[PDB]
A paper describes a structure:
GPR110, also known as ADGRF1, is an aGPCR that plays a key role in neurite growth and synaptogenesis in the cortical neurons. In this work, we report cryo-EM structures of GPR110 in complex with Gq, Gs, Gi, G12 and G13 and systematically compare all major G-protein couplings in one receptor which revealed undisclosed information of G-protein coupling. The global structures of the GPR110/G-protein complexes resemble most of class A GPCR/G-protein complex, in which the G protein use the αH5 of Gα to engage the intracellular cavity of receptor.
Nb3522 is added in the mini-Gs and mini-Gq complex assembling, and scFv16 was added in the Gi, G12 and G13 complex assembling. The global resolutions for the Gq, Gs, Gi, G12 and G13 complex are 2.85 Å, 2.84 Å, 3.09 Å, 2.8 Å and 2.66 Å respectively based on the gold standard of Fourier Shell Correlation (FSC) = 0.143 criterion. The Gq, Gs and G13 complexes have the best overall map, while the Gi and G12 complexes have relative weaker density map on helix 8 (H8) and the intracellular side of TM1-2 of receptor. In positon −5, all the 5 G-proteins have a polar residue. Interestingly, R6232.46 forms hydrogen bonds with the backbone carboxyl group of position −4 of Gαi, Gα12 and Gα13. We also observed a substantial difference between Gi and G12/G13 engagements. We also saw more hydrophobic interactions in the G12/G13 engagement than the Gi engagement. In fact, the Gi complex has fewest interactions (hydrophobic and polar), and this explains the poor coupling of Gi to the receptor.
Numbering used by the authors:
A (entry chain B): 4 to 55, 182 to 235, 240 to 353
B (entry chain E): 2 to 120, 125 to 235
C (entry chain D): 5 to 62
D (entry chain R): 567 to 772, 784 to 854
E (entry chain C): 4 to 340
């Protein structure tokens, strides 16, 4: 009980749906990552080397996967109004520096960096989303601890005053603030300025979250 | 927007012909296409329809089996191929564009028409000729053998104007609505199988032949024609 | 300083524009809204569904 | 009419008041449970096309549920028809139905197992949805339409296509018809056990105990692990009483699938509670 | 400096006195006796399928048949409600897009998002497609809302305490608006296309004239970020959605909040408010997954469109009131009547 025009309209609508679904299906095979860190964090070096106003949509192609690194550092708004839009990202990449282990910006850098890592961990949108962590500026740290007592920022540690001991405290204290090891896990890593490990670590974390996804898609 | 016919000429009965259409200046792969023909001294005749997606085809009762319509999107071209030519096919052809979605205007632009020289609702006109002088108003009619008012609220009458040496121009699509590029002094309408066209304040270049068409069910059939005279 | 003077001038301008307004009671706004909602309540399908024939969505 | 007559060529009289009865009771729940599954499965099909995994898996579940339902009903037919009243007709049709649909359910289990193995091993690879459904249906209802058809073709001429006492296959120094049911039914159990072991290595990161325990529960029945019990009663005449274990664990698979493969998914649970409750 | 401070204090005191002088009786002390809408046993008639991600905005056309809706996937669809047909699909330039517009004469659309820019597309072309005609830049923070004034004028707002009126023909801001303190998230254009009211994340609303650039009013009364704003179709009032689990209806003359919609057992956000054609329904979306319908004159009860299984994000009505469309985070849109 249709004219010719109605049949043509139906044909046009169905064609639109076919192309729409094809494009939407291809647009779900991407990898989405959000970059965060403190101000003056040295995150510029990581952003340039790692490769893995409004928004700086840094696009990369690595291991056949399309990494959308959203750098949102140009924004001057509360994160509570525009972060939830990324709730489908596989990963949050976090950058903090070792060098300011006792350098007071006011107090010091590490306390506020730890506040940021804690705030990102227990954020209710990021219940099931992994957080990959970079600690950076380690050579200047190994040079600089030669004069600092290390106890300025952490007046409860009394360990051996070598590089590995203080670095182990830094890494453990960063990994400490997870309240929800049941669903997400935090991965710790220190920036390897002469290596491409900064890429491989992030790639491996993304792969692991993807396998977890495809495995809990079967009901497990 | 530009549409151009091509591929005509003189052909004996039998053999085959292929009329092509080259389009330029618009998005070719989103419209639907028709071929419409006209007698050497008389009214028009529909031939074929092809649509978007290459899924719907319709032909004429007089030609079916001898004809084949096709489109090519990447190159923006249209084709109609015919076999076993007869004397009733001596005519002049045209491609016509038309796109269907809520609120579009079918038959918006006509091509130029190629010429082919070869050695069932019924719609007629009411009169033959009305002498016309500039400064006066004119009106023309048609009648049809069956209703054109479909179920969904439309009325498929199409009103066209032709001038000597020119191609048709979409005076009226769907018997009530005015096309783009045409003066507002024109108007057209219809009734229960009785149809009309009006031109107020007649000017020069408003003297020619006026044509009616239906589009309710395939195939499509025309009248014979009405002409004003200066 | 210059910044304080500019801020004070901006505050003066904004509060002068906001203060000099013809204002009406909230009850008058409520009454007008009620009257409007009552007047145009016949051509409204969602409040009173169409009887299944003039409704293209049935 | 034990459930073990699917597997065992012989059932001891000494235990007929028990091993037979268990069977019946189990079927009573199984069918009565399985139908419910499919009905619930029809209600929420419109929000499932979230990825290719969701759709493919839940199609496999639909097939397993229906195949088990019909197989068990027609087996109840085959057991409940008197062999001394109707020499032909309904008895032979019952045997056919049991064989075909029982092959069907095992094959669909194999399909779900290969799905999960595909998703984890080769992480990054994608094929079109329609090819997936085509392969799934042509293998799930595939070989079942070859074996239960060929089986009759050679078996009928000698009239070895029935047992004397129960309208089901029997073998005695000759035609071997349950070796066209027993061997397939078990050759998939091995694959799905491997599947569970493969997932457990990923799940055990070092509630590590609770996650692995829930995994073992959710993939014990639905992948066909319980059928292995019958490997103890198809190699011994009268070991002790393994028959009752086989009946108690295998005749209630429908309840297993409904409680685990259905009531364990969180989103489906919430949707059911919002809709029906 | 000191004289300016004293003048500002005096003007603020005058504003406070004016606000206090108009708080004697309100809608529920006047219109609570009006006849309830009862139970709106309001059922799906069509499910517009197609969205592969969340929905963030829809807008109804002027023919009550052609609809526009857009996602955080990067698509903006012009679609047919009567026969559930898709007429146009428009790809976008940046997927972080949070508002859409539909031209009143029926020829253009517009979009905007975090990338700070407002874009304008033209429909009725002779060449057979929909193309972008304008890109407007000059804001600094994210762009949250946009409306058409006419075929050549467009109003935008962003997260900077800034709003702007833009000449479409030339690309130059005719007059820009500053004076908030927090991010501005939305605006809702007057029926006369001369005004606009904008909500900003300081429990703030501000009223602005398009021709001049001056602001004339600021309303307060909320406790967190205000997410969605709309306008009463006669130009006397507007309603805002807050993230502290309440909806509000302010007047553009009363200089205060008129009503608040809230309940004890509701502690979730409001992502959109819109009205119906007659105004006797206020349809508001929440995060509790329900697209509730309020009796907008009593704030009393909630007819419920419990159809969705995720967060609500947008909802709107037609110009003749035939249908309502709700869009929520479940990748589906529902046409209801």
């Amino acid at each position: 009980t249709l004219s010719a025009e109605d049949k043509a309209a139906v044909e046009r609508s169905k064609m639109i749906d076919r192309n729409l679904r094809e494009d939407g299906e291809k647009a779900a095979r991407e990898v989405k990552l959000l970059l965060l860190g403190a101000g003056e964090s040295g995150k510029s070096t990581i952003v340039k080397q790692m490769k893995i106003t409004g928004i700086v949509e840094t696009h990369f192609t690595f291991k056949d996967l399309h990494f959308k690194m959203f750098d949102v550092g140009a924004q001057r708004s509360e994160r509570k109004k525009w972060i939830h839009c990324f709730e489908g990202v596989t990963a949050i990449i976090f950058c903090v520096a070792l060098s300011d282990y006792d350098l007071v910006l006011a107090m010091n850098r590490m306390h506020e960096s730890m506040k940021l890592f804690d705030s990102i961990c227990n954020n209710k949108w990021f219940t099931d989303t992994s957080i990959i962590l970079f600690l950076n500026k380690k050579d200047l740290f190994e040079e600089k601890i030669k004069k600092s007592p290390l106890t300025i920022c952490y007046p409860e540690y009394a360990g051996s005053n070598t590089y590995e001991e203080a670095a182990a405290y830094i890494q453990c204290q960063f990994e400490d603030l997870n309240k929800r090891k049941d669903t997400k896990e935090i991965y710790t890593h220190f920036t390897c300025s002469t290596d491409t490990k900064n890429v491989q670590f992030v790639f491996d974390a993304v792969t692991d979250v993807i396998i977890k996804n495809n495995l809990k898609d079967c009901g497990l | 927007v530009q549409l151009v016919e091509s591929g005509g000429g003189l052909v004996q009965p039998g053999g085959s012909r292929k009329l092509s259409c080259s389009a330029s200046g618009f998005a070719f792969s989103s419209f639907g296409m028709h071929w419409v023909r006209q007698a050497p001294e008389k009214g028009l005749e529909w031939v074929a329809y092809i649509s978007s997606g290459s899924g719907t085809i319709y032909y004429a009762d007089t030609v079916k089996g001898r004809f084949t319509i096709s489109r090519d999107d990447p190159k923006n071209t249209l084709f109609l191929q015919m076999t076993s030519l007869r004397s009733e096919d001596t005519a002049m052809y045209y491609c016509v564009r038309s796109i269907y979605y809520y609120g579009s205007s079918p038959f918006d632009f006509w091509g130029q028409g190629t010429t082919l020289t070869v050695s069932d609702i019924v719609m007629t006109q009411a009169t033959s000729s009305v002498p016309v002088t500039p400064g006066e108003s004119v009106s023309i009619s048609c009648r049809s053998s069956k209703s054109l008012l479909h179920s969904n609220g439309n009325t498929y009458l199409y009103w066209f104007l032709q001038r000597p040496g020119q191609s048709p121009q979409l005076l009226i699509y769907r018997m009530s609505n005015l096309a783009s590029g045409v003066p507002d002094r024109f108007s057209g309408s219809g009734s229960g199988t009785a149809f009309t066209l009006t031109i107020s304040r007649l000017e020069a270049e408003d003297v020619g032949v006026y044509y009616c068409m239906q589009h309710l069910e395939y195939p499509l059939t025309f009248g014979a024609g009405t002409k004003l005279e200066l | 300083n210059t910044a304080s003077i500019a801020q004070a001038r901006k505050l003066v301008e904004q509060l002068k524009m906001e203060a000099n307004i013809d204002r009406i009671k909230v009850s008058k706004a409520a009454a007008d809204l009620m009257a409007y909602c009552e007047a145009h309540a016949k051509e409204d399908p969602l409040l009173t569904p169409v009887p299944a024939s003039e409704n293209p969505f049935r | 009419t034990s459930f073990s007559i699917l597997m065992s060529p012989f059932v001891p009289s000494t235990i007929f008041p028990v091993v037979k009865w268990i069977t019946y009771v189990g079927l009573g729940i199984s069918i009565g449970s399985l139908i419910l599954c499919l009905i619930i499965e029809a209600l929420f099909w419109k929000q499932i096309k979230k990825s290719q995994t969701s759709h493919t898996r839940r199609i496999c579940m639909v097939n397993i549920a229906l195949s088990l339902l019909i197989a068990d009903v027609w087996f109840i037919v085959g057991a409940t028809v008197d062999t001394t009243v109707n020499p032909s007709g309904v008895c032979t049709a019952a045997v056919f139905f049991t064989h075909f649909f029982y092959l069907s359910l095992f094959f669909w289990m194999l399909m779900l197992g290969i799905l999960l193995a595909y998703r984890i091993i080769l992480v990054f690879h994608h094929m079109a949805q329609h090819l997936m459904m085509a392969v799934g249906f042509c293998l799930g209802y595939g070989c079942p339409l070859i074996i239960s058809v060929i089986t009759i073709a050679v078996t009928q001429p000698s009239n070895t296509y029935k047992r004397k006492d129960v309208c089901w296959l029997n073998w005695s120094n000759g035609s071997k018809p349950l070796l066209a049911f027993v061997v397939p039914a078990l050759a998939i159990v091995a694959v799905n056990f491997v599947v569970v072991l493969l997932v457990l290595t990923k799940l055990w990161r070092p509630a590590t105990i609770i996650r692995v325990g829930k995994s073992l529960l959710i993939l014990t029945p639905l992948l066909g692990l319980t059928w292995g019990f019958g490997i103890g009663t198809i190699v011994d005449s009268q070991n002790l009483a393994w028959h009752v274990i086989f009946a108690l664990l295998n005749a209630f698979q429908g309840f297993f699938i409904l409680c685990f493969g259905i009531l364990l998914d969180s989103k489906l649970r919430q949707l059911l509670f919002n809709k029906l409750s | 400096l000191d004289q300016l401070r004293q003048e500002a204090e005096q003007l603020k005191n005058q504003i406070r006195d004016a606000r206090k002088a108009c708080a004697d009786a309100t809608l529920s002390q006047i219109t609570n006796n009006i006849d309830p809408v009862g139970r709106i046993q309001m059922r799906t008639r069509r499910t517009l399928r197609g969205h592969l991600a969340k929905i963030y905005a829809m807008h109804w056309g002027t023919d009550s048949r052609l609809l526009v809706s857009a996602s955080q996937d990067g698509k903006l669809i012009i679609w047919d409600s009567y026969t559930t047909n898709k007429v146009h699909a428009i790809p976008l330039r940046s997927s972080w897009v949070m508002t859409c517009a539909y031209a009143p004469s029926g020829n253009y659309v517009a979009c905007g998002g975090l990338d700070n820019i407002c874009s304008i597309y033209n429909l009725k072309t002779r060449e057979g497609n929909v193309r972008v005609s304008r890109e407007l830049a000059g804001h600094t923070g994210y762009l949250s809302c946009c409306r058409f004034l006419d075929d050549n004028q467009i109003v935008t707002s962003s997260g900077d305490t800034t709003c702007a009126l833009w000449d479409i023909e030339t690309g130059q801001q005719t007059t820009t608006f500053t004076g908030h303190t927090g991010d501005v998230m939305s605006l809702s254009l007057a029926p006369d296309t001369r005004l606009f009211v904008s909500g900003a994340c300081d429990a703030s609303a501000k009223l602005w004239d398009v021709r001049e650039g001056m602001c004339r009013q600021t309303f307060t009364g909320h406790e967190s970020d205000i997410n969605a704003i709309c306008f009463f179709p006669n130009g006397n009032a507007f309603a805002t959605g807050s993230d502290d689990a309440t909806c509000r209806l302010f007047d553009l003359r009363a200089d205060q909040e008129l009503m608040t919609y809230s309940h004890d057992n509701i502690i979730c956000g409001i992502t959109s408010v819109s009205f119906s054609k007659s105004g006797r329904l206020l349809l508001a979306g929440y995060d509790d997954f329900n697209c509730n319908v309020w009796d907008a004159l009593k704030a009393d009860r909630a007819g419920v469109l419990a159809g969705h299984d995720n967060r609500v994000s947008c909802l709107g009505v037609t110009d003749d009131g035939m249908a309502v469309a709700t869009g929520s985070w479940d990748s589906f849109l529902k046409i209801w009547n």
